[PDB]
Nucleic acid binder design. Structure first.
Lengths: 107, 107
RNA sequence: GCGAAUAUUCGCUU
RNA sequence: GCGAAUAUUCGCUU
């Protein structure tokens, strides 16, 4: 089950703000595993102001959308464009795609 | 965008029966393309009583779950277990997984 | 269109 | 862990 599957399955909520607060309450602190690289991340925040068509500056200096990044690097196609980004803060945060992350029992 | 992405994105509805009637109203008649085989199908019905853990009898006579079928035949992993099946009637209907089908402009 | 196998090289925090 | 390339064989309505 992906984080995206979960966001809609765990709690259903017609009021959008309430949906967003609750999902954020239900996800922040959990550990996800990306399906395309054997790394796990703590979900520190959910960025509702970003989506897969948003862009980031790569290690090397060039800019790419998350869409392009995941297709070129891992041949992972992201189908749902409306979904938020998950924020994981190391120690430049890693922004993860909910559709590409599996849930986990987590602290 | 997959059919699964669409089912949640197109119209939001807290009353479950209303969600189900509306999605069925919004999908029945549309043409989908499976992501893992270049075939298209008319959506004739949505089977809310089946899901990816349901089983069918293969051409050859053996029984498999949709989960097993899609993994063994196409290495397609189905992440969302709660989703309904799409029914396409030829001329034994083909049951399609919403998460594995792209939407299309359709009659 | 997705995929399997064997071999040989490769890419990968975001 | 997902994937790329070349070659050689393969599987595919559900």
């Amino acid at each position: 089950e992906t984080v995206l599957d979960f966001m809609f399955n765990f709690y259903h909520q017609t009021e959008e703000h309430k949906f967003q607060e609750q999902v954020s309450k239900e996800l922040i602190g959990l550990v996800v595993l990306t399906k395309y690289n054997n790394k796990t991340y703590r979900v520190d925040d959910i960025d509702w102001d970003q989506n897969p068509k948003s862009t980031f500056k790569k290690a090397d200096g060039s800019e790419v959308s998350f869409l392009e990044y995941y297709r070129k690097q891992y041949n992972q196609e992201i189908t749902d464009l409306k979904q938020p980004m998950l924020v994981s803060q190391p120690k430049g945060p890693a922004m993860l795609i909910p559709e590409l992350c599996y849930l986990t029992g987590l602290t």
